């Protein structure tokens, strides 16, 4: 093929193909080893539906609730986009929990794979942070009172207790400043950190391969 | 039905096997048998189930927030129930925060405490398996209790 | 009763999973029969 | 709120998955002792 030759003499794409076609799947791998991949699929669904809603949602105390109602009743297929975002968030967490059961009960965390387990724990904390921040964006009765309780928990820590509450709320009490900071975390900060740690998780798995039989 | 046997005469493969690696060198070819033909089956199934639940069980709208009126019942998302139960039942606030923070902290120590044993099968790991099963029951017990009055935390209204 | 409804749904999910696995082995049986004939 | 369908799915898949993992582990255990 002329097209293949044009690319091959410049970037040597044939080396990439050889790498892909040199891998094998050992016979002790079964259907339960799919759970890690299924967790990733749910995350990509969140990105697609989450980005679409940034074109209509407005993060202010005066407009937040009204803009969500507009999405549910006026936007073409808006009812479907929002409902998927809510259901797929729960499924991502459920599949991750089952992924942890597989790893522990096959002993896939032992030497030399200690660092893969460590980066896995960090991903678990980040996923839980997505849920808590998004829960309050609608600014309804349930969301508003949940955020009050959560942001007051660290007040019991001596010394660094009160200053931590100030950073989370952006003030002494819950209000507009709290909503602005939570929106920034949900759509900019957490997505960036998740991408970095996913890359580290996948690079090490590629380097070492899957663990051995039982 | 396509398989490739290990080449046990290769010095390089033998070295990796002694270190617990090299298990991607034998078995069924990855491309196209799995990556191209089987993975799309899984992806379609995952997306289809989520779409179906969204159509049949849509989301609610709710009511606007009111800072002068507390709702009668307030609950977080389901996967926060076990830590929520700890918060509402431990009188000492400082003790409650420490217990909550010990969940992620405890998990970090798992690989460094079980490296003495070098078996993978759970039936050759009697002590470790027992600890795991006890932890699973406790987490479910706390989670269900979060939806009941505090006076039923220990019994769940069964005995 | 909310509790009663939750229990019913949980039991159904267990049944669906087992049926799905079983139908998988039925397909493998059919493939073997055609292969030998 | 209490979500009936969501809670039912969570409590159904967790036990069946655990049972499947123990069954496969047991079969490999027996053949290794032969």
């Amino acid at each position: 093929s002329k097209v293949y030759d044009w690319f091959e003499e410049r970037l040597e794409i044939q080396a990439i193909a050889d790498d892909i076609t040199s891998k094998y799947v050992p016979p002790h791998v079964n259907i339960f080893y799919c759970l890690g991949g299924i967790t990733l699929t749910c995350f990509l669904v969140q990105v697609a539906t989450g980005f679409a809603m940034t074109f209509y949602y407005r993060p202010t105390v005066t407009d937040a609730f009204a803009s969500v109602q507009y999405i549910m009743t006026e936007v073409n297929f808006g009812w479907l986009i929002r409902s998927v975002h809510r259901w797929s968030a729960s499924m991502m967490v459920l599949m991750m929990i089952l992924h942890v059961f597989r790893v522990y009960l096959t002993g896939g965390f032992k030497k030399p794979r200690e660092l893969t387990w460590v980066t896995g724990v960090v991903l678990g904390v980040l996923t839980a942070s997505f849920g808590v921040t998004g829960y309050s964006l609608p600014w309804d009765q349930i969301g508003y009172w949940a955020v009050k309780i959560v942001t007051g928990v660290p007040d019991a820590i001596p010394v660094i207790g009160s200053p931590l509450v100030e950073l989370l709320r952006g003030s002494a009490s819950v209000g507009q400043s709290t909503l602005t900071r939570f929106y920034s975390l949900h759509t900019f900060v957490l997505p960036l950190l998740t991408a970095v740690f996913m890359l580290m998780h996948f690079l090490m798995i590629r380097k070492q391969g899957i663990s051995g039989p039982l | 039905g396509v398989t490739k046997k290990p080449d046990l005469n290769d010095p390089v493969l033998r070295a990796k096997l002694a270190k617990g690696m090299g298990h991607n060198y034998y078995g069924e070819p990855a491309w196209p048998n799995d990556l191209l033909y089987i993975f799309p089956v899984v992806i379609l199934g995952t997306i289809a189930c989520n779409v179906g639940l969204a159509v049949l069980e849509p989301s609610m709208i709710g009511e606007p927030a009111d800072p002068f009126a507390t709702p009668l019942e307030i609950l977080p998302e389901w996967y926060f129930f076990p830590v929520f139960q700890i918060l509402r039942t431990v009188p000492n606030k400082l003790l409650g925060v420490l217990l909550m923070a010990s969940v992620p902290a405890g998990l970090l120590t798992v690989p460094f405490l079980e490296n003495v044993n070098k078996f993978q099968n759970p039936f050759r790991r009697p002590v470790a398996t027992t600890v795991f099963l006890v932890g699973t029951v406790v987490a479910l017990w706390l989670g269900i209790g979060a939806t009941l009055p505090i006076d039923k935390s220990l019994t769940l209204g069964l005995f | 009763n909310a509790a009663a409804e939750i229990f019913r749904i949980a039991a159904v999910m267990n049944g669906l999973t087992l049926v799905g696995v079983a139908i998988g082995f039925v397909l493998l049986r059919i493939e073997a029969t055609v292969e030998e004939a | 709120m209490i979500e009936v369908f969501l809670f039912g799915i969570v409590l159904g898949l967790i036990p069946i998955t655990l049972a499947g993992l123990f069954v496969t582990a047991y079969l490999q255990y027996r053949r290794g002792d032969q």
Binding site: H28, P213 | - | - | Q28
Partner: peptide, 26 residues
């Protein structure tokens, strides 16, 4: 007996290693 054996093979593949084998164990 053949039917039972047929089912057992499908659940777990019979052409795999085991962690007690000297090659992997050593």
């Amino acid at each position: 007996k053949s039917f039972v054996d047929w089912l057992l093979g499908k659940i777990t593949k019979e052409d795999q290693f085991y962690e007690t084998d000297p090659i992997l164990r050593g």
